[PDB]
Structures are given as C-alpha cells and as structure tokens.
Ligand binder design. Sequence first.
Ligand SMILES: [Zn+2]
Length: 92
Amino acid sequence: MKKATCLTDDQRWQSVLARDPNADGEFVFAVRTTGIFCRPSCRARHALRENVSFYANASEALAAGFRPCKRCQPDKANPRQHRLDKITHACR
Ligand SMILES: [Zn+2]
C-alpha cells in the first residue's frame, strides 16, 4: 500500500534523541555504560547510542535482567551533597 514494516533504527533512536514517544509510544532502551534500561526520555546526562539496546516492551529488557527506569531515576556522585559544574574555582 504505502509502507511495508517499521522504517529504521534511526527513526527509533531519533525518537530517543528528541524527548516525547515519536514512533513506538512504549519502546525501551538499554545503555550498558550507566547500567540502565529505561523508556525514551532519560534527560540527566545520558550515555550515547554506542552501547545502547532497544525493545518494544520493558518485560524483555527485564527478561534480560537490567535496571527498570519509569521515573528518569537521577544519580551523580551524591547530587544533593557535592556538585562543581566546572573546574574554574581558586579565589572569591
Ligand atoms: Zn529514564
């Protein structure tokens, strides 16, 4: 008719680069550098598409035995306590 099946891994992960669910409203992504399997909108400084694994449902990435994020669950070396955004601190 118009299109056979889904287009490309690029439309998929582009759905990631953006924010809100573009193609697969429920698809899940597993970056094995932060050890997190989560839905598309992980905003906090998120690893690349270089070690990342995609699925239709999190029941798979769980059947994998990975970390279920449905609450873009944050974590930077104690976020509340410490910080230092840059490395220009000596005076003042
Ligand atoms: Zn998340």
